[PDB]
């Protein structure tokens, strides 16, 4: 409808795949080469389904901060025959608040879904499903099951991936440029 949704659509159309694990179907953001991200609660194993194709996992790393606190981001390298468009230049370098964000989801359940979530708070600490978690972004939208892995964007920036909610608010794990230096 507007330049926010334009930027979100550009990311969804080229940089997402549908990931299936034993814990469900997730939106999965491809970042560069064969490297993607997913919520750590997806429990990625040695094999994953990518757009319903059996795919070997070459590496998977559940990120934690230097206090050894969960960040809820798993970086996955896929044994895939095709590279992602490199979008690392759209990642923020530092923790921040944002205005006018869009949460975008693409699964079997929720195809081509875009949600204007509005103002995003650097919330920081969250007890997420009983796990102390850092670098959480918060938005005042009643997000639901099926949205985990959803991409949080502003115009010009890919800022997070949706990891949970409490019925009134939604929560995303920050993406930082420093996670994907090669």
3-state class (DSSP) for residue 119: strand
Could you tell me the resolution of this structure in angstroms?
1.4
Within 13 Å of residue 57, how many CA atoms lie on the same side as its CB?
Answer: 19
Q: Are 118 and 127 in contact (CB under 8 A)?
A: no
Contact 36, 51 (CB under 8 A): no
Strands 151-154 and 47-50: unpaired
Query: Among 41, 106, 134, 162, which one carries the catalytic annotation?
Result: 41
* Residue 8 C-alpha from the chain's centroid: 13
Task: Find, among 43, 61, 53, the residue nearest to 79 by Cα.
Answer: 53
In angstroms, rounded to a whole number, what is the distance separating the alpha carbons of residues 81 and 101? 32
Query: Is residue 10 helix, strand or coil?
Result: helix
Tokens 């969250």 correspond to: 126
Q: How far apart are CA 21 and CA 4, in angstroms?
A: 30
Structural domain boundaries of the chain?
1-15+85-182, 16-84
Q: Rounded to an integer, what distance in angstroms lies between the CA atom of residue 162 and that of residue 59? A: 22
Residue 44 DSSP one-character state: -
* C-alpha torsion angle, residues 164, 146, 30, 171 (rounded to 10): -20
CB atoms within 10 A of CB 8: 23
Task: Tell me which of 72, 106, 134, 162 is the catalytic residue.
Answer: 72
Per the listing, tokens 């009983």 go with 130
Residue 112 structure tokens: 């081509």
Q: Is the distance from CB of 124 to CB of 96 less than 8 angstroms?
A: no
Experimental method: X-ray
Identify the CA nearest to 177 among candidates 92, 83, 69. 92
E strand or H helix that includes residue 14: helix 3-15
Do 170 and 177 touch, CB atoms closer than 8 A?
Answer: no
What is the C-alpha R_g of the chain?
15
Q: Please enumerate in sequence order all residues whose Cβ is within 8 A of that of 87, keeping only pairs 6 or more positions apart, or say none.
A: 11, 15, 30, 31, 32, 158
Q: Has 148 been annotated as catalytic?
A: yes
Q: Are 105 and 152 in contact (CB under 8 A)?
A: no
Phi-psi region of 3 (alpha: psi -120 to 50; beta: other; left: phi over 0): alpha
Q: Is 72 a catalytic residue?
A: yes
Q: What's the rounded Cα separation, in Å, for the pair 175 and 104?
A: 15
What are the angstrom distances between the C-alpha of 168 and each of 74, 143, 165? 26, 7, 7
Q: Is 169 helix (H, G, I), strand (E, B) or coil?
A: coil
| Distance (Å, whole) CA 75 – CA 39 | 9
**Catalytic residue of the set 25, 134, 148, 162:** 148
């Amino acid at each position: 409808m507007g330049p926010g949704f334009d930027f979100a659509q550009a990311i969804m159309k080229k940089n997402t795949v549908i990931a299936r694990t034993e814990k469900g179907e997730f939106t999965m953001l491809g970042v560069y080469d064969r490297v993607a991200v997913i919520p750590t609660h997806a429990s990625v194993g040695e094999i994953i389904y990518i757009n319903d194709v059996e795919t070997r996992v070459l590496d998977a790393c559940a990120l934690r901060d230097l206090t050894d606190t969960n960040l809820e981001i798993t970086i996955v390298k896929l044994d895939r025959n095709q590279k992602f468009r490199d979008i690392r230049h759209f990642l923020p370098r530092c923790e921040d608040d944002y205005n006018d964000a869009v949460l975008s989801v693409h699964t079997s359940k929720f195809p081509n879904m875009y949600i204007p979530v509005g103002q995003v708070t650097n919330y920081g600490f969250l007890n997420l499903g009983g796990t102390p978690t850092h670098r959480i972004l918060m938005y005042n939208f009643p997000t639901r099951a099926g949205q985990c892995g959803g991409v949080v964007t502003t115009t010009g920036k890919v800022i997070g991936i949706h990891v949970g909610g409490n019925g009134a608010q939604g929560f995303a794990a920050m993406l930082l440029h420093s996670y994907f230096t090669d």
